[PDB]
RNA sequence: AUAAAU
């Protein structure tokens, strides 16, 4: 769980930011509030405009998945009634899989949510809560629950899988599980195990983020 | 095309639905408006054709020839429709595209026995419309300029053997001399159906009060398919009796020589 | 009036009510199939429901919704 | 405190669904039901036609003309689905996929939505991830056609020969129409794909002497063999739900979960929904879960693993008989 | 391809009594729905169309409305697009007699024709032209299920490759498709089809009397 | 008794007038089309003929609407769930539901959702909220309550999402119908705290709406049940 | 004491705490929760019964709120009003003609689309279009709000603007003041007009605030201005 | 009543 991110890194964006978790590494932008198109006003909520760029060739229909389930963690985060009739882009530029695309897009779309999360925050747009995602993996042998698992780990796994929860109270109250993409098949007492020692180390994260956000920030401050 | 208010429209009716039917013009309902045409002049081509119609209607043909293996290619004449300024895609331009393919079919309209080179090959030819302006259905416009340029295509002359079963010779065709496409187009004809009366040539306002129309295609001297009845508008569309229908190919069937022969001269 | 029943008359003659015969060669009797309902019971085991049963359902949820004002 | 006394405007069902989606649901959801007249877990009746689109429908009268190798037509409540699966000869010099196109049609003209993307990639992904089709049964077993000089027409092919290599591959496209739709509908275009997976047939496939002029490569009019799918891991399709009412119910002489969501007001107003993909072994392929409206409990999670393994079961009894 | 799921672009391909059944009203996504299967022979034709509207046209001055129709492969790909587009365009030039226009003002019918199935066996030692009285029959069943002003029933045959459409009970023509086949069949065909009219006349008004009941 | 019972689209009905023979005096029968039924043109014989014709399938009812006598009879066709409803069209003293799109400073414009019979029912118009198929209106400023109609706060009228029952005046352009909630019948209907975000709130009074939920109160322009 | 977004509140339920800018009241469950991440400050007054608060956080995309100063630029003219947008890529706000000194219904103010303006924002609701006004009641008899001429405008975060505005301990304006005459407008939403008697004066000046803005270094901006107004001379 | 409805 050593990740590394940077906030604040582009100029002609409301917000930005670049998560790094081991090999997979993306760059994230939001602008917004800002005027949409006819086609996405919604009379009462902010209109969510959410493009996901592949790190190698072209945007596909797999790129339109990673889209999709980035939607579904970012929109009840974003406080959209407060921007009736407004968007808000949000574009993610993945530059690094850190895994084998053409197997896997676990890692990628964890980065993406922690990115997008990120940027959203240094963008100044209303957020009901805060938010973290963390890749799984299973192994085929031992049968051992890796949570960050590397490249390498995912060849040799029996199922893989994404986790995003919804946090509030300083970090310490998970408010409910926005995202749980699991690829593969179940044994319940592994699950368990797995929620538990993983709620562990996602609080030992929002500590360190915690840490990295009051220490960039802080100097900008009066 | 032609944008006209519902006075004009109804006076135009009268005008040409009346039983000594009058066109606005003065035309009678089997006269057909001037036209000019223009052949052989793209050098690049085997064959070339321009008509110009009365109201700036213009349209351009084109006509290129490759050799093909008949036994793998079907289709030995291949119609392209074209207008700059307009999509491709345009319903009116697959519908016409598939019309004249049909029109210009190797074993239908066409003696496809003079594209033959050998037993193994033949020529291919490619017929491109180009429609620069038109104010009503180029259909026929289209027509008579494929007709005029296929009556004036020159095609390579071939040189080596033709039995590519035993000795197999690859073709070859010998340099500068070139023979003439001797072949016979087809025609096709387009009709307005006003009340009950029936006018070859339906110009832009005519076709606007139209109640129907026909497409009747023309070769060898008698009435061929494809044969379509079609609406020249949408606001005035309504079904027509039988003898209308029947008085139609019979129009046809004997001002079309007449054309013929205004339009055989080389 | 009498020009109508002479071409009205024939106009009416000509149908003859034929008779209808109803089969479907493969889409008909899947496509138009009106809406079905099934609820597993703690057997695992599926349960069909009489037609006018489901509809009953309809009617009485209905009557609930409108007159049974709190 | 204020007490008052006051009437709350009501509106007939009809007016109701169009003035809110949410106040539809929940006023539905008092009396234990839902807009679509159903219970908190009833589903919707399943029926299908498998094979009546292919061209291997009959044994005896085979069609020439039609390319579809194995098809399947599904209808679940007012939903309609049509699938139907062509094919293709690679040459090649663990397990794969097969490559949908869905066309879900709602009376508008134009380019494919977001909906007929994610769907056509997501069962792309189910299926290369459940490793329902491995590559290996997409080997091309060819043959060879020896032509007597009009005496005869022969033609051979080896079964040993392929065994003892354990080389064209063979290439599934699929097309799945959607017709009436009414809510989420990816689980009906895997269960349609599904079925159509169960019954494919690949011909056989051979060339005439040809030199590497132009040589076509031919498939067998005729003969042909079972596509063979790892029955194991065949899975099947199920959606559920999250959602609070706060609404009070008359008495008359805590989270409440929904299976298999139909209808606009479902669709709309569940934020917590769980996806899943359930195996009669009882291994599960894949899991989709997004909460947004509501907190995910443990507790729902298990009750949607037996009630997707209750559909599997159900799904699996039904391709048996 | 980046908005469909084409696979590999270096594969190639695969190389190798009348009887009427009607139902309409399925459909719950659209204003009115049909279903014709009609098995003649060896040969039987299956097609859906899917009727929407009339539907509001924003800032329209039309004081009629207008029909759109396109036919699409819901199968079998045999039918080139450019055919398909011809065909539409010969369907609208007879619904727009059919269709009282002058009641739907401001507004825009659309139709979609979806051609699910055909079968075609030929031995061996038009073609959509046989497709075509189908169609019609398809649409006008699906328009006066919608609720669509007719101001009579559309209905068509095929002989020899000749279509022509009837109303008013064969006594006028709202459409005529002739393809090859022979000459000098002018007057059979005429008496053909209308006899194809008034048997798809009959079927499609007790179709929508049996539903509609 | 004479002309059919039901009519299919295309079946004749009745020719254009009609007479009878009673208490020694001729009785004229005027038939006039309706909902369903299209008068027409018809020829036989090189004669001209115009009948009242179906249009929808349906079983057919008429009813009287207005020395020597006269007379008026109504023909129709009515059908016979899903219900169409397509001559529901809004029109000039009709009420309709609407709901808030948008909100400006001296207008409020909506979109037409249902309309009210006449003698509650209700005619939903089905359509895409989505793309903008749905018809739209305008509610002004002055159309806001006959009370002070040159000064009014609109925000403090409306809200967007808000569901608001309205009279239309007149069709106006294409784009905007005229919608007034002058009358005390009228006003917002249903609608929610924070724009939605909140629970429910009920009408009290005219000027002000409150939710007997969160105790939240926000000033809306209610009506009268 | 940096506050995150979903961080727990001392202040006890009962007694309120007036909204500030970080802080968020929640239309469904009544609780008082801040959504920024920053520095909290809390202000009181009195022995006993009131309380304020808000949240200064970094954000550069300005919302409009009662009683702002803002520095919009005229796009285009309505029938009644201006559009003016504060901002790029933001919602239009309304600027009343009306909203002038000697204003009258006969006589339309001269401002062209492409000016700059000073303003305040009278009316801001989040579900209506925002308007501001060229008069701002609460400053004095004169607002001294008027369209700006010539001058340079500057892009800078919220906070960044807020802390030149309201803070008088900020050393900038003081910095800039022992290099050169100048006279600035500060504007809420972000921006920054700077004018001098000559270009190469607005130019040190822009750098400067720019590299300030960069920079957020007491210790450095007086530096800063040290060689931008150095660096000036030997490239005239 | 000194220039009205982009």
């Not at chain 1, 996602?202 to 920030?217: F, G, H, K, M």
């Not at chain 3, 009797?29 to 006018?52: C, F, M, Q, W």
């Not at chain 5, 559309?154 to 006028?172: L, R």
């Not at chain 6, 403090?156 to 009358?183: H, M, W």
Request: charged share 25%; glycine share 6%; net charge negative.
């Amino acid at each position: 769980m050593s990740v590394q991110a940077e906030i604040g890194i582009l100029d002609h964006v409301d917000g930005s930011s670049e998560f790094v978790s081991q090999d997979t590494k993306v760059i994230c932008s939001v602008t917004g509030p800002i005027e949409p198109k006819a086609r996405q006003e919604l009379p009462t909520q902010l209109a969510l405009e959410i493009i996901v760029r592949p790190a190698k060739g072209v945007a596909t229909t797999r790129e339109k998945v990673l889209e999709d389930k980035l939607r579904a963690v970012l929109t009840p985060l974003i406080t959209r009634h407060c921007y009736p009739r407004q968007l808000c882009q949000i574009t993610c530029q993945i530059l690094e899989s850190g895994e084998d695309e053409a197997e896997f897009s676990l890692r990628e779309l964890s980065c993406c949510i922690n990115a997008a999360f990120l940027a959203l925050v240094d963008a100044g747009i209303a957020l009901n809560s805060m938010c973290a995602s963390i890749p799984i993996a299973i192994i085929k042998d031992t049968s051992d629950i890796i949570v960050d698992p590397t490249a390498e780990q995912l060849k040799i796994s029996l199922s893989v899988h994404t986790l995003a929860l919804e946090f509030v109270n300083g970090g310490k109250v998970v408010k409910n599980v926005l995202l749980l993409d699991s690829n593969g098949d179940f044994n319940e007492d592994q699950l368990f195990s797995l929620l538990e020692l993983g709620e562990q180390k996602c609080q030992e994260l929002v500590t360190n983020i915690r840490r990295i956000i009051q220490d960039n920030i802080s100097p900008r401050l009066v | 095309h032609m944008s006209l208010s519902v006075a004009e429209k109804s006076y135009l009716y009268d005008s040409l639905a009346s039983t000594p039917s009058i066109r606005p013009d003065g035309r009678l309902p089997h006269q057909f408006r001037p036209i000019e045409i223009f052949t052989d002049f793209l050098p690049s081509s085997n064959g070339s054709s321009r008509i110009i119609a009365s109201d700036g209607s213009e349209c351009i043909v084109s006509i290129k020839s490759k050799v093909v293996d008949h036994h793998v290619e079907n289709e030995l004449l291949q119609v392209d429709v074209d207008i700059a300024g307009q999509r491709d895609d345009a319903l009116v331009v697959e519908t016409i595209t598939s019309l004249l393919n049909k029109v210009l079919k190797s074993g239908s309209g066409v003696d496809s026995s003079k594209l033959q080179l050998t037993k193994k090959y033949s020529f291919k030819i490619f017929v491109d419309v180009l429609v620069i302006s038109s104010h009503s259905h180029p259909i026929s416009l289209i027509s008579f300029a494929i007709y005029s340029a296929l009556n004036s295509t020159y095609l390579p002359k071939l040189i080596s053997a033709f039995d590519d079963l035993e000795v197999e010779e690859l073709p070859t065709f010998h340099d500068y001399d070139m023979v003439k496409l001797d072949i016979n187009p087809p025609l096709v004809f387009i009709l307005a159906v006003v009340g009950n009366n029936m006018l070859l040539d339906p110009a832009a306002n005519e076709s606007e009060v139209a109640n129907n129309g026909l497409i009747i295609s023309w070769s060898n001297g008698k009435i061929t398919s494809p044969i379509r009845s079609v609406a020249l508008n949408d606001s005035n569309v309504k079904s027509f009796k039988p003898h209308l229908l029947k008085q139609g190919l019979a129009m046809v069937e004997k001002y079309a020589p007449d054309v013929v022969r205004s339009l055989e001269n080389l | 009036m009498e020009r109508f029943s002479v071409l009205c008359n024939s106009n009416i003659s000509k149908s003859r009510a034929k008779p209808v015969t109803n089969s479907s060669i493969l889409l008909g009797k899947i496509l138009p199939r009106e809406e079905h309902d099934i609820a597993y019971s703690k057997d695992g085991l599926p349960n069909k429901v009489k037609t006018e049963d489901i509809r009953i359902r309809a009617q009485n949820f209905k009557s609930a919704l409108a007159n049974l004002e709190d | 405190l204020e007490t008052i006394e006051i009437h709350p405007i009501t509106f007939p069902p009809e007016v109701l669904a169009r003035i809110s989606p949410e106040l539809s649901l929940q006023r539905h959801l008092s009396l234990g039901i839902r807009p679509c007249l159903r219970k908190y877990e009833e589903f919707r009746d399943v029926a299908i036609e498998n094979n009546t689109l292919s061209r291997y429908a009959d044994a005896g009268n085979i069609d020439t003309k039609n390319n579809i190798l194995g098809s399947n037509v599904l209808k679940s409540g007012k939903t309609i689905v049509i699938t139907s699966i062509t094919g293709g000869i690679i040459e090649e010099t663990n397990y794969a996929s097969v490559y949908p196109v869905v066309e879900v049609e709602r009376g508008r003209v134009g380019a494919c939505t977001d909906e007929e993307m994610t769907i056509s990639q997501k069962l792309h992904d189910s299926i290369l991830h459940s490793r329902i089709l491995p590559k290996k049964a997409l080997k091309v077993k060819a043959g060879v056609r020896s032509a007597n000089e009009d005496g005869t027409f022969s033609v051979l092919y080896p079964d040993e020969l392929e065994d003892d290599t354990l080389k064209w591959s063979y290439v599934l496209y699929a097309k799945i129409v959607v017709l009436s739709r009414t809510g989420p509908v990816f689980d009906l275009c895997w269960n349609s794909l599904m079925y159509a997976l169960q019954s494919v047939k690949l011909p056989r496939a051979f060339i005439d002497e040809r030199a590497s002029e132009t040589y076509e490569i031919i498939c067998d009019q005729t003969k042909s063999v079972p596509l063979m799918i790892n029955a194991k891991n065949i899975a099947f399709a199920s959606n559920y739900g999250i959602v609070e009412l706060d609404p009070e119910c008359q008495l008359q002489n805590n989270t409440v979960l929904i299976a298999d969501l139909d209808t606009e007001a479902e669709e709309t107003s569940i934020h917590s929904t769980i996806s899943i993909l359930a195996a009669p072994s009882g291994n599960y392929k894949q899991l989709t879960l997004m909460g947004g409206g509501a907190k995910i409990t443990p507790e729902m999670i298990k009750r949607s693993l037996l009630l997707s393994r209750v559909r599997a079961d159900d799904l699996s009894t039904r391709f048996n008989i | 391809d980046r908005r469909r799921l084409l696979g590999p672009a270096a594969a190639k391909p695969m190389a190798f009594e009348q009887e009427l059944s009607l139902h309409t009203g399925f459909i719950e996504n659209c204003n009115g729905s049909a279903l014709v299967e009609a098995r003649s022979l060896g040969h039987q034709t299956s097609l859906i169309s899917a009727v929407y509207g009339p539907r509001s046209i924003r800032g329209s001055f039309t004081s009629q409305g207008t029909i759109s129709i396109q036919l699409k492969n819901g199968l079998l790909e045999k039918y080139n697009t450019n055919e398909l587009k011809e065909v539409s365009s010969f369907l609208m030039g007879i619904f727009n007699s059919v269709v009282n226009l002058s009641r739907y003002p401001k507004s825009g019918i659309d139709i979609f024709v979806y051609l699910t199935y055909d079968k075609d066996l030929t031995n061996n030692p038009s073609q959509i032209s046989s497709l075509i009285p189908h169609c019609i029959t398809s649409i006008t069943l699906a328009l006066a299920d919608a609720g669509i002003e007719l101001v009579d029933m559309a209905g068509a045959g095929e002989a020899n490759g000749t279509v022509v459409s009837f109303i008013k009970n064969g006594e006028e023509i709202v459409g005529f498709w002739k393809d090859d086949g022979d000459d000098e069949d002018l007057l059979e065909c005429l008496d053909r089809c209308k006899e194809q009219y008034n048997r798809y006349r009959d079927l499609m008004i007790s179709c929508l009397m049996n539903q509609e009941t | 008794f004479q002309f059919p019972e039901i009519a299919y689209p295309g079946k004749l009905i009745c020719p254009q007038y009609g007479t009878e023979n009673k208490d020694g005096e001729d009785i004229i029968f005027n038939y006039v089309p309706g909902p369903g039924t299209k008068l027409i043109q018809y020829e036989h014989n090189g004669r001209t003929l115009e009948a009242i014709t179906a249009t929808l399938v349906g079983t057919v009812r008429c009813e009287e609407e207005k020395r020597r006598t006269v007379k008026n009879i109504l023909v129709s066709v009515l059908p016979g769930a899903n219900n169409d409803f397509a001559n529901n069209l809004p029109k000039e003293g009709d009420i309709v539901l609407t709901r808030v799109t948008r909100l400006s400073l001296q207008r409020a414009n909506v979109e037409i959702l249902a309309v009210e019979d006449k003698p509650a029912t209700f005619s939903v118009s089905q359509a895409s909220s989505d793309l903008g198929e749905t018809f739209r209106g305008i509610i002004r400023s002055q159309d806001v309550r006959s009370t002070d109609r040159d000064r009014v706060k609109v925000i403090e009228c409306f809200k967007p999402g808000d569901i608001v029952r309205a009279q239309v005046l007149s069709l106006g352009d294409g784009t905007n119908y005229y919608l007034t909630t002058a009358r005390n019948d009228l006003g917002v209907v249903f609608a929610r705290a924070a724009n939605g975000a909140g629970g429910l709130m009920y009408a009290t009074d005219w000027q002000m709406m409150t939710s007997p939920v969160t105790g939240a109160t926000e000033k809306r322009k209610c009506a009268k049940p | 004491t940096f506050i995150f977004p979903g961080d727990s509140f001392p202040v006890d339920p009962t007694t309120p705490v007036k909204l500030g800018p970080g802080i968020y009241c929640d239309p469904n469950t009544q609780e008082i929760r801040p959504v920024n991440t920053g520095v909290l400050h809390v202000s009181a007054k009195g022995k006993s019964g009131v309380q304020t608060a808000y949240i200064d956080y970094s954000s550069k995309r300005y919302i409009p709120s009662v009683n702002d100063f803002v520095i919009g630029v005229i796009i285009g003219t309505f029938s009644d009003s201006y559009k003016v947008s504060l901002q790029n890529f933001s919602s239009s706000v309304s600027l009343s003609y009306m909203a002038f000194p000697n204003a009258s219904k006969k006589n339309r103010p001269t401002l062209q689309v492409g000016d700059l303006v000073y303003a305040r924002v009278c009316t801001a609701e989040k579900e209506l279009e925002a308007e501001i006004e060229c008069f701002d009641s609460t400053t004095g008899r004169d607002a001294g709000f008027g369209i700006l001429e010539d001058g340079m405008i500057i892009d800078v975060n919220l906070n960044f603007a807020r802390q030149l505005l309201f803070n008088n301990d900020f050393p900038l304006l003081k910095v800039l003041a022992a290099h050169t005459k100048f006279e600035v407008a500060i504007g809420l939403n972000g921006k920054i007009w700077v004018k001098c008697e000559e270009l190469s004066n607005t130019l040190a000046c822009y750098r400067t605030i720019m590299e300030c803005c960069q920079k957020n270094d007491t210790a450095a901006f007086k530096d800063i201005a040290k060689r931008q107004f150095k660096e000036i001379l030997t490239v005239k």
